[PDB]
Amino acid sequence: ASKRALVILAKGAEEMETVIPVDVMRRAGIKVTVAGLAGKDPVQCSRDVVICPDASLEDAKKEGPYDVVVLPGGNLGAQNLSESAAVKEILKEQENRKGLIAAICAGPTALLAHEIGFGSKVTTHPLAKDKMMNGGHYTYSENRVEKDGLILTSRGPGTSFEFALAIVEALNGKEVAAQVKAPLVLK
Amino acid sequence: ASKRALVILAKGAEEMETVIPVDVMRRAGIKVTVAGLAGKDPVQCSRDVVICPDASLEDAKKEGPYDVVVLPGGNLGAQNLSESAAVKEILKEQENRKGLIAAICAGPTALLAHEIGFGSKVTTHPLAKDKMMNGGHYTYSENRVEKDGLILTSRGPGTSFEFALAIVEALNGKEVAAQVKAPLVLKDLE
């Protein structure tokens, strides 16, 4: 069957960090569900792009399991993910069942907030490093994409293609990632 | 006063080629209007991301002028742009007032369709090259972003950041473009 991705879309999400992985994963044949943290209502992103989610998180939760749960960044987006009990429940479940969790830019700070993946090697945006490392619950990495077991992290809007392709590779293999990447006209 | 950008959003637009330039231009302090070709309703893009436009094109066309008009790609998106008389009028008026026109991926084939900027060095997505240069109305460039006068073109989702930063440099200067670039964590120069 198709692999499945859940992308949790909160108010203030960075729209490039949301759209690049959704689009790239769908190019790979992954069934992606863009789930509104606050319900099915359109979501205002960090630079005011308004994206209409496929479903509420509430509804998407009862439609899994997902091969990957993806947390976009955005200062406000990440704060909102970090404050949600529903997100906590979803990530705890994914981690417990040995499913992939992928977070980009400020997104990984929601992993910290929800006590997810402690002991893992992670990266973040350089501006998020200090918040992420508060408590020494992770080992920090400067890699543009970092994968430590089932915790996959990345640094910024400009690493979003790399992040998304790393997810495709994890789920579908190198050859699929290659087929997807070719037409993207990446450097 | 701030510069203004009109981004014309059609059903089937490539959502990365739409969102990257909107976001990057807004980072630069450009006032960007995402204008829906069909009206004010949300627009389904090529990989099913649904974007709510700020305004209809019919409306935004009345809030001119714009410092840049931006045509995203996407096969179906570019086809809808190519088939619109409203888009033709906008592009004709922009070229006539010596304003920038910026088109990415299959988006430049809309310039061909509307007879815009013939004689320009342009680039497109590799799979759009043949259609763009049928009739010999342009010179082709393999550069990831090309700028020939007021015709600025680029190749694909993977060149969207460079495309958007070129628009920023053309409108707001190299200093602002470098300011906007710094926090993106794009690749270094080496």
In the three-class reduction of DSSP (H, G, I as helix; E, B as strand; rest coil), residue A17 is classed as: helix
CA separation for the pair A137, A37 (Å, rounded): 26
What is the residue-wise DSSP string for A125-176?
-GGGHHHHHTTS-SEE---SEEEETTEEEE--GGGHHHHHHHHHHHHH-HHH
Show which residues on chain B lie within 8 Å of chain A, measured between beta carbons: 14-16, 19-20, 22-23, 26-27, 34, 42, 46-52, 125-127, 144, 155-159, 161, 183-187
Q: Decide if B52 and A34 are in contact by the 8 Å CB cutoff.
A: no
Show which residues on chain A lie within 8 Å of chain B, measured between beta carbons: 14-16, 19-20, 22-23, 26-27, 34, 42, 46-52, 105, 125-127, 144, 155-159, 161, 183-187
Q: Record the tokens describing residue A89, joined without a space.
A: 């429940």
CA separation for the pair A144, A105 (Å, rounded): 10
Can you tell me which residue has the tokens 């496929």?
Answer: A54
Q: Quick check: A159 and A145 in contact, CB under 8 A?
A: yes
Residue A140 burial (10 A CB sphere; 0-12, 13-18, 19+):
middle
Closest in B22, B157, B161 to A49, CB measured: B22
| Residue ranges with strand state E in chain B | 4-9, 31-36, 43-44, 50-52, 55-56, 68-71, 100-104, 121-122, 139-140, 145-148, 151-154
Which of B68, B27, B117 has its CA nearest to residue A48? B27
Helices (H), ranges, chain A: 15-27, 57-61, 75-83, 85-96, 108-113, 129-133, 160-172, 174-181
Can you tell me which residue has the tokens 């008009």?
Answer: B69
CA separation for the pair B159, B161 (Å, rounded): 6
CA separation for the pair B175, B173 (Å, rounded): 6
Q: Which CATH class is domain B1-190?
A: alpha beta
CB proximity list for B45: less than 8 A, separation 6 or greater: B11, B12, B13, B14, B15, B18, B51, B74, B77
Tally A–B CB contacts below 8 A: 93
Angle between helices B160-172 and B174-181 (to 10 degrees): 140
For the four alpha carbons of B148, B14, A15 and B56, in that order, the dihedral sign comes to positive
CA separation for the pair B179, B23 (Å, rounded): 14
Contact list, B127 vs chain A (CB under 8 Å): 183
Does the annotation mark B125 as catalytic?
A: yes
The CA–CA distances, whole Å, from B2 to A128, B5, B31, B66 equal 30, 10, 7, 11
Tell me the CATH number of domain A1-187, given options 3.40.50.1110, 3.30.60.50, 3.40.50.880, 3.90.550.10.
3.40.50.880
Experimental method: X-ray
Closest in A42, A157, A161 to B184, CB measured: A157
Q: Which residue of B has its CA nearest to A128?
A: B183
Which of B23, B7, B19, B24 has its CA nearest to residue B181? B24
Does the annotation mark A105 as catalytic?
A: yes
